[PDB]
């Protein structure tokens, strides 16, 4: 019922300045105030609008101060109503504009429970359990022998000697991912985001010793390092059969043009995530000196670390059957 000519702002309606105002409007909120700012009856209208508004929470939550509401409503009335009894029309327009999905409501909360206890959003982890796991992570030798009891004490001791030096450095995602994988048989993985830094540094040394014992020196060198200064989640043909046996639960894929797609191995997804993190930056070695020599190794990345990481995951899969 409206008209677009540029007067697009009047297209949903049911005088001399109408074209100029429409063009200015077309060229972020409450733009009527600015167009009114370009340019008694004015005071009478302002008083009437203030009376209409005189007789909320939703306006305040949307950012409309109670002082600014009459001015905005007056600008809307002047632009969208006067340009097209007048008193009754203005009254109805103001009343409609004052109170315009269910999720857009702004309700009043009604608060034996106290007013503070009325807000019922919980944390997910018991505070006492976090304190318990902080102490647990300090028992490195006990934890390592809970996973593989054949690890010599000297190897664990050498790894733990570097904790003090690397305690001043910040920990990076690739370090935590590998520690979570290896240590999960004795230490929960999700606790890594809750334990303090000193607890994490001990676990990083613990996992490094286990990888050293198993024969994965090429990847164990990156557990205790410092930051110096194509992304395909597919599994190589060599290991695809083994990984599907050890991690049978895979992620389903969206069908393309009705054609079904084979599931993607979730364990392969995590391998690529760790592989991408390692090569995202250069690292400075801080770990045991003897381990650095056994890896044929500031710290250069071997061209086949993804294969080594895949074999490490294969070892863990066999160990946790």
């Amino acid at each position: 019922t409206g008209f677009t000519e540029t007067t697009t702002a009047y297209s949903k309606i049911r005088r001399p300045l109408v074209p100029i105002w429409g063009e200015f409007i077309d060229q972020e909120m409450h733009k009527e105030c600015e167009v009114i700012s370009l340019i008694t009856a004015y005071d009478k209208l302002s008083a009437y609008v203030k009376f209409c508004v005189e007789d909320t929470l939703a306006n305040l939550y949307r950012g409309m101060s109670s002082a600014e509401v009459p001015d905005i409503l007056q600008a809307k009335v002047m632009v969208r109503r006067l340009t097209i009894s007048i008193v009754s029309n203005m009254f109805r327009y103001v009343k409609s504009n004052l109170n315009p999905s269910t999720a857009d409501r702004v309700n009043d909360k009604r608060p034996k429970t106290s007013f503070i206890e009325s807000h019922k959003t919980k944390q997910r982890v018991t505070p006492g359990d976090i304190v318990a796991y902080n102490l647990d992570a300090l028992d490195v030798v006990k934890l390592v022998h809970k996973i593989d009891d054949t690890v010599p004490v000297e190897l664990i001791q050498e790894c733990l000697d570097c904790v003090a030096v690397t305690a001043t450095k910040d920990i990076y995602p690739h370090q935590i991912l590998l520690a979570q994988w290896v240590m999960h048989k004795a230490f929960p993985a999700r606790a890594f985001s809750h334990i303090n830094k000193n607890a994490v540094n001990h676990l990083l040394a613990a996992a490094q010793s286990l990888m050293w014992h198993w024969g994965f020196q090429q990847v164990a060198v990156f557990m205790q390092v410092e930051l110096y200064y194509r992304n395909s989640t597919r599994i190589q043909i060599k290991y695809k059969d083994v990984m599907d046996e050890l991690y049978p639960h895979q992620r389903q894929q969206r069908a393309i043009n009705g054609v079904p797609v084979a599931p993607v191995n979730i364990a392969g997804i995590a391998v690529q995530s760790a592989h991408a993190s390692i090569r995202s930056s250069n690292w400075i070695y801080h770990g045991p000196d003897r381990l650095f020599k056994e890896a044929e190794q500031v710290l250069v990345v071997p061209a086949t670390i993804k294969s080594v990481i895949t074999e490490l995951v294969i070892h863990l899969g066999k160990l946790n059957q």
Binding site: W181, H184, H249, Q321
Partner: protein, 191 residues
């Protein structure tokens, strides 16, 4: 006191899907069985089922066959009932218009088995009414109980592809892909 034993009936509800998946609480190295069947009993520690959050980067740790059998009290969520109670009924609601389903493969054999039988039960109910409506055009009178039952069947069965899917709710609570309800009975010894 052995002659003054009451019996209690209660229901446990679990939701899985986009946020969490079921754990292997009643199965073995070769079978995935999240919850006991009809006629089974609740295992001695009292856990009926438990769910673990979705996280792909922790798959080599949290998704090993051993980790799926071990319940973590601090970080998982479980529903606990009376140990030794006998499961007598199961009801499952599924949201089939998900592409792709967030459930990992091999974790829904038990869920599908009960849902398939339940769908057949509701499908036959809707078929019976439609046959009656065809024969008795404008002469078909049904009780208020039967009318609400047919409404439930349509809420359960999948919608035709031509129309928008249903967003199922339980009293302002949105359903996930799977909703499981387990009913069990326990006999109490007064002491």
């Amino acid at each position: 006191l052995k002659r003054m034993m009451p019996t209690s009936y209660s229901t446990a509800v679990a939701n899985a899907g986009r946020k969490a998946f079921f754990l292997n609480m009643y199965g073995d190295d070769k079978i995935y069985k999240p919850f006991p069947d009809i006629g089974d009993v609740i295992r001695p520690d009292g856990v009926i089922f438990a769910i673990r959050d979705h996280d792909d980067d922790l798959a080599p740790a949290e998704m090993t066959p051993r980790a799926l059998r071990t319940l973590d009290r601090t970080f998982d969520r479980a529903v606990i009932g009376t140990p030794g109670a006998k499961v007598i009924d199961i009801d499952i609601w599924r949201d089939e218009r998900v592409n792709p389903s967030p459930t990992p493969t091999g974790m829904d054999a038990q869920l599908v088995k009960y849902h398939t039988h339940l769908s057949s039960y509701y499908r036959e109910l809707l078929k019976i009414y439609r046959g009656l409506l065809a024969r008795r055009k404008d002469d078909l009178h049904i009780t208020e109980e039967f009318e609400r039952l047919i409404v439930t069947a349509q809420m359960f069965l999948p919608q035709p592809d031509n129309v928008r899917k249903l967003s199922r709710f339980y009293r302002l609570d949105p359903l996930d892909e799977w909703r499981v309800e387990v009913t069990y009975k326990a006999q109490k010894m007064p002491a």
